[PDB]
Amino acid sequence: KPDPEVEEQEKQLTTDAARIGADAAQKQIQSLNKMCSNLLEKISKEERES
């Protein structure tokens, strides 16, 4: 009934939505991952159509 993990998760989500870093995040890595995911989705759609 202590629920310390719930409080830690709430604090991590409420401080900066990540609890570590505000402007030094992985936004560029996230964009690269999104581009890679779009390319993989296009390749998978082509493979399915083939």
């Binding site: 690269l32 991952n33 581009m35 890679c36 390319l39 993989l40 390749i43 082509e46 493979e47």
Partner: protein
């Protein structure tokens, strides 16, 4: 003999290449990309195994109810054991004769 071992090595290499292609596809589509397209070919490699399955499906299947290759043909093996035993007996007799000759001196 030759063809059976060749087909076995071919199936083993096919399985190894399928596992390697799956690992490469996982490593590529996991994190970072046009090379991921070749990852789809990995799935095609899986289809190759299916063909091998078909190759195993429409294989010989001589009886499919019993075991083929009747007889171990080890009669030749038994004959070879007898030949080696005769060679050992001859070696023993020769050693006895040699001991007798050395004692004669």
């Amino acid at each position: 003999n030759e063809r059976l071992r060749a087909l076995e090595d071919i199936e083993r290499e096919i399985g190894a290449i399928l596992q390697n292609a799956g690992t490469a596809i996982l490593e590529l589509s996991k994190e970072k990309r046009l090379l991921d397209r070749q990852a789809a070919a990995f799935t095609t490699s899986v289809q190759h195994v299916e063909a091998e399955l078909s190759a195993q499906i429409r294989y010989l299947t001589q009886v499919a109810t019993g075991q083929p290759h009747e007889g171990s043909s080890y009669s030749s093996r038994k004959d070879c054991q007898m030949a080696l035993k005769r060679v050992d007996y001859a070696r023993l007799k020769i050693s006895d004769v040699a001991r007798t000759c050395e004692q004669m001196l």
